[PDB]
Amino acid sequence: ADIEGAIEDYVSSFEEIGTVIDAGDGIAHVEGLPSV
Amino acid sequence: SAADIEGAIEDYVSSFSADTEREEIGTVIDAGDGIAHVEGLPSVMTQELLEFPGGVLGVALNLDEHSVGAVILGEFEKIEEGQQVKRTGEVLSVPVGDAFLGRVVNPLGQPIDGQGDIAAETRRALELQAPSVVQRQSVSEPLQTGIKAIDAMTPIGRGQRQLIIGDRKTGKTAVCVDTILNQREAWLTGDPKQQVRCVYVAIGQKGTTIASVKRALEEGGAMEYTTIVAAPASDAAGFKWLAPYTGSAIGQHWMYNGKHVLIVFDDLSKQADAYRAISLLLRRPPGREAFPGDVFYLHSRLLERCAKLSDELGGGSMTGLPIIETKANDISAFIPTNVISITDGQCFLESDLFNQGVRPAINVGVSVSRVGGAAQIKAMKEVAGSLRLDLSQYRELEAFAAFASDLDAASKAQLDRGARLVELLKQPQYSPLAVEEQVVAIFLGTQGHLDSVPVEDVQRFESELLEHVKASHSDIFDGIRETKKLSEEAEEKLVSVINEFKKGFQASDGSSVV
Amino acid sequence: RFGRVLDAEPRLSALLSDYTTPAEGRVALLDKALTGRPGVNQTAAALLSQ
Amino acid sequence: TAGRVVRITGPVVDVEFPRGSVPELFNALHAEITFGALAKTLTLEVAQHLGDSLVRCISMQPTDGLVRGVEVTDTGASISVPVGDGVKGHVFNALGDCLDDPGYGKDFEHWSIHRKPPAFSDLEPRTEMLETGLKVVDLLTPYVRGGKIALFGGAGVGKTVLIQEMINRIARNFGGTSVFAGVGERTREGNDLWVELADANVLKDTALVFGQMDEPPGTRMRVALSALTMAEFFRDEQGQDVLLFIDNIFRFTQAGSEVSTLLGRMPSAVGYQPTLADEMGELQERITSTRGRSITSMQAVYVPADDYTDPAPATTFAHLDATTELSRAVFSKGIFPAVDPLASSSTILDPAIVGDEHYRVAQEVIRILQRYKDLQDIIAILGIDELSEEDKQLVNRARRIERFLSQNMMAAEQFTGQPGSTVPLKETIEAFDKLTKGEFDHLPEQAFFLIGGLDDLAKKAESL
């Protein structure tokens, strides 16, 4: 159906750096980094 | 053979009709490790029997506002997210009837021995009320286990709850199988007031061990009045949890119908372990040894079905023989403590006594029966009255075995008597003794007729003497059985036959006993 | 009708589900796919966009 | 309609699938790790359905390098292992991939590792003695042909040595098929077993499946099932008597415990998983022998903390016909095979099966040893001189009996230098009847140490 074409068109607009959100005692939680 | 091969199916096709009844459906949203959470089923009731698409069954055990956590009864791997769950409007129930005698059934009442179906007389819910205080009666009838140690020291009266407790490979299943075997003489009488119907509930045992127990019962003739409610280790935790209740329900049906039942739970430790697994998988809060708060209740709710009913309810009784495996002889563990509190008495089996050759290995002294003499026939009550004190004195004197020359005459006599009593309470496996034979055997020891036999020969001297009495002087056994007491003339006859036998008895050391 | 349409093609349902992406993009995707055609009722289209 | 990795926590991987394609439990899923150093195809096993079209899986290979969002494709069936006579003579891992010849069985018949235990209708007890040639085992813990046998022990008390010796004593002459499942044992001993079997020409009749401890929890869980599947094929589809050696079956429950908390289960006593008994029961019940189809299974069981009250060994005890129980107390005293004669037991040790003579001698030996154990407390403080004359004689008997239960096993040549020995059951019964009755009280106790037989006893006594 035409829905697939619209989805593909939307996909055209829909380094990799994360950010520490929680840290302490030797543990750090990192938001982002989808490909880690 | 017959036309039935077709006819039965015909009867089905002519009789089958799947009508369209309204049904409430849930959907499995989680499933793992034997627990399935079912969204929906607004009207489901606690401990209901849900049916899943693949013929699988579960028990609605946790009810929340979000989901119904149900323990799945086998075939858990066939449960998936999104599956439709239908509620059967029935709480956990099992079929019950006389057709269960000689059958092996899983905790749902379905046969697993491979024979035909079981013609159920009725169904009983597993969680029915136990007999109330007003509905019971004093335990006053013996249930002869056939083990001299138990029948003399810690008698079990039908209506009692006696715990066989001890570490692994100490003789527990042996004691209970012997108890089941000993009821064949009662069964062959045909009198329901004497017949005892047995339910061996195997929890967590391997299939070959249950097969071994069934073989031991068949070769002993006990399978024609015994049912084996088997929850092998292969079965889900739900079956191990339910098996004692299944067996208790099958027994209760007979009990309320005037029959006498004997229930063996082997073991209740595995029942508790299965319940712990279910509870932790449902995220119920844990306590000591991770058991849920109501684990005691789990056992209590069970063992309190074992009762003797009043004459208004038929006078039937259900005798409990729970078996508990104590790790490293630690009777202070949680489940052992709970069931020692619940039960009316305890046969403590110890591996040290087993290795000493004291097998069946009941640690007399530590072992107790709160029903006491009320559970013994008058003959055993009078004959075995002094036995406990004699054994206690022997255990006190055992440290003096090497100095018998330096002890008082009475003390040395007590030591010699005690050694022979200990040899007397020993008993070979799968060979229970009728109550008359036990009476005569304990009479040999308590009255001092073994004081001349060497210790190492006592086991033989008893075994032959009874073998003589049965064959030639059965009047003694018949009197004890028919009258329940050892009459004075019967006692004199017994003493005379003992003395006559003594002359013809060859001690293993070559000496003469007179 | 839109419910059964979105039941099929779960990829479209997942794309609409993602709320991390800007809402305007999802609304535009829905319009291009489902509600941008004359067959969509005005009230239904508004409800779907919301 | 492939899945997508959402959450990775050590060996546990959560995968979100489309709504209509959530895989069934115990299905095998394939992810791919593309990092060069650790590139591989990662096999996950669906362990839980967690809702919202998510499933939680136990990874078979290490998850190091796995990336969130990576495509996960469902195999549609549980982990399958090769079966047939082809497996004999080769080394496989938990996944059925051959090690000594990669890609070897890829075309064989493949069976799921997961299958229900044989129905209770098909189970009958086994009561045929298996003569191993070890004095202690043959006398006090007689093994059952077609039964279930275990070698319990602490850490490093000789379970691997004894199981290798049992492979040497039972399989070398065995006419059927052997299967060895190395479940989380040491890889060095696995290779030693492989070369030993190759040198003795037993490999052609043996299938080895290794899931050694270098592997993550998933393999240490499923390798026992993978090997038991081959054993079950040989049992059912061919009817050959089968030996099934497992070392160490505790690693199955330990791996289950390792993944337990990551699967969301609340820990049970001693930190084990709540499903300890059921999980181990399924596997153990698959090992039984069905009538006319024999599996003689020997399972080395590891006892944590040398504590026989630990839930894992305690629950395993119910699944076994014969249970030799090695103890560090006996191992410390120099006795090898290190069996505790009192704690060990066997169901075939009845007068109706082993005979009245064997039973009497075994029970007298156990009686003497128990009395000696009770006296050891007195002897260490009040001294032997204060015991009764009968008890003193019994102590002298018991020391010699303990040392005579020691034996120079073939697999322990590198523990003692001297070659192994085999003692017929009749000779064992005769020798122990003589000991317990006194015919050897004049010989020094060190003459009874690591000898294996009456002729060796005489020779070592003369050498003393």
Ligand SMILES: Nc1ncnc2c1ncn2[C@@H]1O[C@H](COP(=O)(O)OP(=O)(O)OP(=O)(O)O)[C@@H](O)[C@H]1O
């Ligand atoms: N009275 C007895 N005389 C001789 N041997 C006995 C006696 N009672 C039990 N045995 C033997 O002791 C061993 C243990 O018996 P049994 O199977 O009844 O033990 P159990 O306490 O139920 O243990 P398990 O936990 O293994 O079920 C078996 O070899 C049995 O033959």
Ligand SMILES: [Mg+2]
């Ligand atoms: Mg038992």
